Write a protein that binds this ligand. Sequence first.
Ligand SMILES: O=C(O)c1ccc(-c2cccc(C(=O)O)c2)cc1
Ligand SMILES: O=C(O)c1ccc(-c2cccc(C(=O)O)c2)cc1
Ligand SMILES: [Cl-]
Ligand code: NA
Ligand code: NA
Lengths: 241, 241
Amino acid sequence: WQENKSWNAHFTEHKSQGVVVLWNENKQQGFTNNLKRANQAFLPASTFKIPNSLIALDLGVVKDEHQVFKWDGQTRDIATWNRDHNLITAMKYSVVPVYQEFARQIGEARMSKMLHAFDYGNEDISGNVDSFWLDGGIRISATEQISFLRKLYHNKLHVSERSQRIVKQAMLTEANGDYIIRAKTGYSTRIEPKIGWWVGWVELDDNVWFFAMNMDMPTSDGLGLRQAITKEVLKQEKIIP
Amino acid sequence: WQENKSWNAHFTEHKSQGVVVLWNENKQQGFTNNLKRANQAFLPASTFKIPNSLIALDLGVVKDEHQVFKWDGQTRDIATWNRDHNLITAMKYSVVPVYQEFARQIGEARMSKMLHAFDYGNEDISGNVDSFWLDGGIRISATEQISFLRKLYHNKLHVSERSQRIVKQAMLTEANGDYIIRAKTGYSTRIEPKIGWWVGWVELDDNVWFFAMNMDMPTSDGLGLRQAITKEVLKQEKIIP
Ligand SMILES: O=C(O)c1ccc(-c2cccc(C(=O)O)c2)cc1
Ligand SMILES: O=C(O)c1ccc(-c2cccc(C(=O)O)c2)cc1
Ligand SMILES: [Cl-]
Ligand code: NA
Ligand code: NA
């Protein structure tokens, strides 16, 4: 691990505070602008859709990435939620109601066992099994997110290789000739402090850069800064052009 | 199957000639600017890296997408070829020497049986074991490419699902919030007519558009037209913005 306080300039310029954590897989070396916040555990919010997907797929709650989960007919306040989804689009649009149904079908017993198997955060599912990642007891730090994502990247989580490959496909966010980003956003609003998450990794030709960022998110107006600030760090470090 | 000759304007504007074939998976509907050329069989060239990858993986010639195939030290005309590669980068940069090694390991007997099992093109491997897809007897039409790609997309090829998932991952070319393109370029230069290929599919939120295009390619200078003309068709059909 190494601290680079120059990345704070990317938070200060947008009048925000947070942490970006990078992990160079080839060098087995990590970097961050705030090592203490890098190890501070927060609610994972919708970044929990990564382990949730893995568990649901491995248990057969989700058959594959094509299975359609019908809209339940309740009109909610994000338009993308009021439609049918598969695993790919439910993750892409952070469709909480779809994943709440996953968690209910997983059940608390299997959810707790799998999170312990995953070594995921504090492994605590206090609260409702269908909302504990938004207002329950689960807590995870950016470094714990990287450690979890690293296992997922190497297919070393205690689930089938197939489940891990499907979830890594579902995490696909952006890709061109220069890089591939597999990642998941998070927005924790039910319990203070309100924060935004972005966790994942950048695949290059000859290396992988794991990243986990969170930042204070008092309003929804700064949600785009999760990707913007992370990308500025990635560009400064010559990871992406 | 419906013919739309208005797409010829995209070929004519670049003083080019070729065919684009689209398959709407949801509607089970096919479209092309030239029905006859859509069913004319050409050398697959480097689009054969899709079945070649699947066979190498299923036979254990390639263990996974991380296995490094070290540069043999011979400096070739393509700069990106003169380095170590894995399955991902070898597909991305169409590293023929890496796949010629795969084909030599597969051998004629297993290659022929697998292509027969794949129902791939004319299923004929006549010629050299490590170059038949560039100057041998194998031929495939644009519609036969789509028929093959649909099987791959649905994990219905005879090989393991894992092999098909690894290859679909390697086919990743481009992705954003609007669409995902999994595809493979090809350039057939050894036997006339010299043609460029681009085959794959466009993943949308609620549909998948399979595509297979080829076009006359007298020099490498116009290889960018493969993606450019295809995207103009995709834009015209309101598939990508
Ligand atoms: O009920 C909750 O707690 C909750 C509600 C909405 C979101 C959400 C919806 C769409 C995008 C995003 C984003 O992070 O961009 C977040 C997250 C959580
Ligand atoms: O020896 C042959 O026949 C051969 C040689 C090179 C290529 C090639 C190299 C890089 C990109 C592309 C492309 O299609 O963009 C093609 C293909 C075939
Ligand atoms: Cl992918
Ligand atoms: Na991956
Ligand atoms: Na090619």
